[PDB]
Amino acid sequence: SVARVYANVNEKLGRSWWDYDNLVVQWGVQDNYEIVRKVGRGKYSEVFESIHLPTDSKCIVKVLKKKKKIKREIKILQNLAGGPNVVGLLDVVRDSQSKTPSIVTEYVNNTEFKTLYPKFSDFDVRYYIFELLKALDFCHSKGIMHRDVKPHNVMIDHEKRTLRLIDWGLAEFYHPGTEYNVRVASRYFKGPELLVDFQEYDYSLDMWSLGCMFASMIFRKEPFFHGHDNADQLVKIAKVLGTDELYTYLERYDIDLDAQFDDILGRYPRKPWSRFVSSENQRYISSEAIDFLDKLLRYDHQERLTAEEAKEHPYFEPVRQAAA
Ligand SMILES: O=C(O)c1ccc2c(c1)nc(Nc1cccc(Cl)c1)c1ccncc12
C-alpha cells in the first residue's frame, strides 16, 4: 500500500525536511517566559497559560517528557509554519540544568467540545469541518500525518469563528512503504487499519478519524463508535459498516484477523446511515451530509476522500458561497 496522493512530497523536499533525528534546535531564552496557570495535563505534556514577558502577551507553554519524539514534534511545527488553521509555534525553550524542553505556542480561546458541539447549527458544522480540512490538506501536502485527529485536538474559538489543529506529538512524516506503529490515535478514532495491525497506512488515517468526529456532530452521539477495548472497537465498527465489506477488505490487503475475533465477531448486515437519524439530531441531517460521511467511513483507506477531494463535496457549497 502507498498513498494515492502526496506520496513523493518527502522525496522532493529531501533530508532537511524530514530528518528530525539531526534537528539542531536554536533554543530561546527560558527567563523570557513566565508561567501563570496550568490549563491541562496530557499523557505526554503539561500545558500552562503563560506570558511572554518582553511583550506581556498571552501564550501557552507545553512541557514535554525518547529524545527522537521531541525532535519530531518540533521539526513538524517548524515545517508547518504559516499553514491555515495549524497551531502557531512561538518558541522552544528548556531548563538550564534539567534540560527539560518546552514548546511555546499561541493561546486559543477554546470552548470544550461536549459544551460547544450541541450549540452548533448545520452551517456551523459545515464551516468548522471545512476549516479542519484546510489544516489536514495543508499538512498532508507537506508529507505529514497528524494521527490523533479528535475533538480534544481541535480548538475552536466560536466568537472569533477560528480553528486550530493542535498536539502534533503523534504526527509523522509519510514515506512510501514504511511500516508505521499502529498504537496511535485514541481508541474511538482509530481506523480499521490500526485495529487489524495493517502498518503500511498513510494520510487517509486522518480522514477516518475526521469521519468519526463528523458522525459525532451530525448524529449527536459522542463517541460514535463506543468500544471497550481495541477488539470491541472493531466489532462496533463492523456492526455499522457490515462484515461483508470487512472480509473483502481483508482479502484485498491480505490481512488475516487475530484468532480471538472468531468468538466475538459475528455476521452483521450494513446498518444504513438513515437508521441513526432522530428528532434531536435531524437539524444536522441532509442527503449531502450522509454522502460525505459515507465517503470518509470506509474500511479500505484507499476508498476514502482526500482532504482536497472532501473540500469540493456539495456539503461544503453553503460554505464556499458564504466566502464570496
Ligand atoms: O499540544 C498542543 O500542541 C497544544 C497547543 C495549544 C494548546 C493545547 C495544546 N492545550 C490547551 N489546553 C488544554 C485543555 C485540556 C487538556 C490539556 Cl493537556 C490542554 C490549550 C489551551 C489554550 N490554547 C492553546 C492550547
Catalytic residue among 19, 31, 56, 148: 148
Q: Which of 50, 28, 31, 47 is nearest to 39 (CA)?
A: 47
Buried b (16+ CB within 10 A) or exposed e, 199-214: eebbbbbbbbbbbbbb
Helix and strand numbers (H, E) in the chain are 12, 9
Q: Which residue has the cell 491541562?
A: 40
Residues contacting residue 206 through CB under 8 Å, at least 6 positions apart: 136, 140, 145, 146, 147, 149, 307
Going from the Cα of 216 to the center of ligand 1, the distance in angstroms, rounded, reads 21
Is 38's C-beta closer than 6 angstroms to any atom of ligand 1? Answer: no
Per DSSP, the residues of 30-83 read: GGGEEEEEEEEE-SSEEEEEEEETTTTEEEEEEEE--HHHHHHHHHHHHHTTT-
Q: Which residue has the cell 517548524?
A: 78
In the chain the domains, ranked by start, together with CATH numbers, are 1-18+108-324 (1.10.510.10), 19-107 (3.30.200.20)
Q: Which three cell numbers stand for residue 157?
A: 474559538
Indicate which residue's Cα is closest to atom 19 of ligand 1: 40
Q: Which three cell numbers stand for residue 7?
A: 506520496
Q: For a substitution probing ligand 1, which of 39, 61, 80 has the most ligand atoms within 8 Å of its CB?
A: 39
Provide the sign of the torsion angle of the four alpha carbons 303, 211, 77, 21, taken in this order.
negative
Is 44's C-beta closer than 6 angstroms to any atom of ligand 1? Answer: no
Q: Which three cell numbers stand for residue 247?
A: 472480509
Angle at which helices 287-294 and 204-219 cross, to 10°: 150
Question: Could you tell me if 80 and 134 are in contact, meaning their C-beta atoms sit under 8 angstroms apart?
Answer: no
Provide the sign of the torsion angle of the four alpha carbons 315, 319, 322, 323, taken in this order.
negative
In terms of Cβ atoms closer than 10 Å to its own Cβ (0-12, 13-18, 19+), residue 6 is buried
Q: How many CB atoms lie within 10 A of CB 105?
A: 22
Is 50's C-beta closer than 6 angstroms to any atom of ligand 1? Answer: no
Amino acid at 119: K
Instruction: Collapse the DSSP code of 263 into the 3-class scheme (helix H, G, I; strand E, B; otherwise coil) and give the result.
Output: coil
Provide the sign of the torsion angle of the four alpha carbons 194, 196, 200, 201, taken in this order.
negative
Is 39's C-beta closer than 6 angstroms to any atom of ligand 1? Answer: yes
Q: Which of 189, 218, 220, 222 is nearest to 206 (CA)?
A: 189
* Alpha carbon distance 162, 127 (integer Å): 10
Indicate which residue's Cα is closest to atom 13 of ligand 1: 40
Provide the sign of the torsion angle of the four alpha carbons 23, 209, 182, 179, taken in this order.
negative
Q: Which three cell numbers stand for residue 5?
A: 496522493
Question: Could you tell me if 265 and 234 are in contact, meaning their C-beta atoms sit under 8 angstroms apart?
Answer: yes
Indicate which residue's Cα is closest to atom 5 of ligand 1: 166
Listed as own residue / partner, the contacts of 131-135 with beta carbons closer than 8 Å and 24 or more positions apart are: 131/84, 131/85, 131/163, 132/85, 132/163, 132/165, 132/210, 132/213, 133/210, 133/307, 133/310, 133/311, 133/316, 134/84, 134/85, 134/311, 135/83, 135/84, 135/85, 135/86, 135/163, 135/164, 135/165
Going from the Cα of 40 to the center of ligand 1, the distance in angstroms, rounded, reads 7
* Alpha carbon distance 35, 16 (integer Å): 33
Is 167's C-beta closer than 6 angstroms to any atom of ligand 1? Answer: yes
Indicate which residue's Cα is closest to atom 1 of ligand 1: 167
Distances (CA, A) of 104 to 28, 61, 87, 248: 10, 5, 10, 46
Per DSSP, the residues of 10-24 read: HHHH-HHHH-GGG--
Angle at which helices 204-219 and 122-140 cross, to 10°: 170
Per DSSP, the residues of 265-292 read: ----PPPPGGGG--TTTGGG--HHHHHH
Residue 282 CA, distance from chain mean position:
26
Question: Could you tell me if 185 and 192 are in contact, meaning their C-beta atoms sit under 8 angstroms apart?
Answer: no
3-state per-residue secondary structure call for 193-211: HHHCCCCCCCCHHHHHHHH
In the Cβ-directed half-sphere of 105, how many Cα atoms lie within 13 Å? 26
Q: Which of 151, 155, 150, 60 is nearest to 111 (CA)?
A: 155
Resolution value (Å, 1 decimal): 2.3
- 148 tagged catalytic: yes
Q: Which of 34, 139, 31 is nearest to 78 (CA)?
A: 139
Q: Which residues pair with 164 in a beta bridge?
A: 155
Is 257's C-beta closer than 6 angstroms to any atom of ligand 1? Answer: no
Q: How many CB atoms lie within 10 A of CB 158?
A: 16
* Alpha carbon distance 113, 188 (integer Å): 15
Q: Which three cell numbers stand for residue 108?
A: 486559543
Question: Could you tell me if 240 and 225 are in contact, meaning their C-beta atoms sit under 8 angstroms apart?
Answer: yes
Q: How many CB atoms lie within 10 A of CB 102?
A: 24
Angle at which helices 243-253 and 230-241 cross, to 10°: 110
Q: For a substitution probing ligand 1, which of 46, 166, 170, 186 has the most ligand atoms within 8 Å of its CB?
A: 166
Q: For a substitution probing ligand 1, which of 46, 64, 155 has the most ligand atoms within 8 Å of its CB?
A: 155
Question: Could you tell me if 262 and 293 are in contact, meaning their C-beta atoms sit under 8 angstroms apart?
Answer: no
Amino acid at 74: I
* Alpha carbon distance 167, 151 (integer Å): 11
Q: Which of 153, 146, 253 is nearest to 203 (CA)?
A: 146
* Alpha carbon distance 18, 144 (integer Å): 9
Is 7's C-beta closer than 6 angstroms to any atom of ligand 1? Answer: no
Amino acid at 130: F
Residue 64 CA, distance from chain mean position:
20
* Alpha carbon distance 76, 92 (integer Å): 13
* Alpha carbon distance 87, 162 (integer Å): 11
* Alpha carbon distance 252, 222 (integer Å): 31
* Alpha carbon distance 287, 104 (integer Å): 43
* Alpha carbon distance 196, 261 (integer Å): 10
User: In the PDB record, what is the listed experimental method?
Assistant: X-ray
Is 41's C-beta closer than 6 angstroms to any atom of ligand 1? Answer: yes
Q: Which of 22, 38, 15 is nearest to 102 (CA)?
A: 38
* Alpha carbon distance 184, 89 (integer Å): 23
Residues contacting residue 124 through CB under 8 Å, at least 6 positions apart: none
